[PDB]
Amino acid sequence: SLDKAMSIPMWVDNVQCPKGPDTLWQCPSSPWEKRLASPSEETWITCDNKIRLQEGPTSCSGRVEIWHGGSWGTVCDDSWDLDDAQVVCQQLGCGPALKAFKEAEFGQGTGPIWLNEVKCKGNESSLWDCPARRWGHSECGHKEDAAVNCTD
Amino acid sequence: ACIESGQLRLVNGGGRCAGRVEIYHEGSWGTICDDSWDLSDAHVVCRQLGCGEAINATGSAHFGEGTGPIWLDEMKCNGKESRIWQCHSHGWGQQNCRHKEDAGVICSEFMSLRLTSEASREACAGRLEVFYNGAWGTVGKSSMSETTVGVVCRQLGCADKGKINPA
Ligand SMILES: [Ca+2]
Ligand SMILES: [Ca+2]
Ligand SMILES: [Ca+2]
Ligand SMILES: [Ca+2]
Ligand SMILES: [Ca+2]
């Protein structure tokens, strides 16, 4: 737990969820309480990474998969370059990309494809922040899914 | 006494020997997918046109964009076939590619011309260059009619008339 905190009451405790609630408010639990919060009882959760590399013999390398709209998606081969590949492995913390591959030679695609024509200056933080055609509507074939490798 | 079936045209190239590949089937002209395409796959098409051998193969619709429906997809060819029809194909109308990715060839007989004097690759007052088999060369000064000068200017488009410069 991060040391820096604002002393504020713990509203609820002992939250128990069924299978597949849309939101926490569907999970039954104990009644609301305004009790003072001990530092240990506060919860910090770290969701998984937004982007992940799949089907690569090395764990760090593979096809580029992005969690968008609740589902994992890939990136098309259009206008893909080495400088674009710098951003993706900057997220992972891996070393700079040694080479970029295209036309799904690395593996056949999966999931609904989200991004296309990705245009990254090379110093941008995230591909989501990068300017590119968003929210699908890319109609790229799954044989056009992209993949890269980067230094460990 | 038959006009035979199917024709092979090279469009948008500036010459008969270089152009985006278009194949005639039925009453429509269609393009070839760029996937599984290489210079070995381009030897047959350059031979059937009579131009000769291929020096490059272009993909990703760099040469141009084709509007016609794709006739053949995923061609693997030995490179010694008389016509593209003997090369292996997935099947007629098996369009899995798209107009975003298109295939073209550059044969050997395609030629181009330009004048370059200095600090400017295109300048209509300078030495003449010819382009054969991907190489740049000039023509001899000896035995050139003034009419030949005129056609040079007309081809590039500097003026209706030109005069030989000995210097
Ligand atoms: Ca492509
Ligand atoms: Ca780019
Ligand atoms: Ca392709
Ligand atoms: Ca082939
Ligand atoms: Ca295909």
Q: How far apart are CA A68 and CA A72, in angstroms?
A: 6
Are residues B120 and B134 in contact, defined by beta-carbon separation less than 8 angstroms?
A: no
CA of B96 to the centre of ligand 5 (A): 5
Could you tell me the sign of the dihedral formed by the alpha carbons of A10, A12, A16, A18, in that order? negative
> Up-side HSE of residue A13: CA atoms within 13 Å toward CB?
11
Query: Is B100 in Cβ contact with A78 (below 8 Å)?
Result: yes
CA distance B150 to B163: 8
The helix (run of H) or strand (run of E) holding residue B104 is strand B104-107
Dist CA A76 CA A141 (whole Å):
8
The sign one gets for the Cα dihedral B72, B76, B80, B81 is: negative
Residues in chain B closer than 8 A to A143 (CB atoms): 35, 96
Residue with tokens 């599984």: B36
Ramachandran angles phi, psi of A5, nearest 5°: -155, 160
Min distance B101 CA to chain A CA atoms (Å): 10
Method: cryo-EM
Shortest Cα distance from A27 to chain B (angstroms)?
47
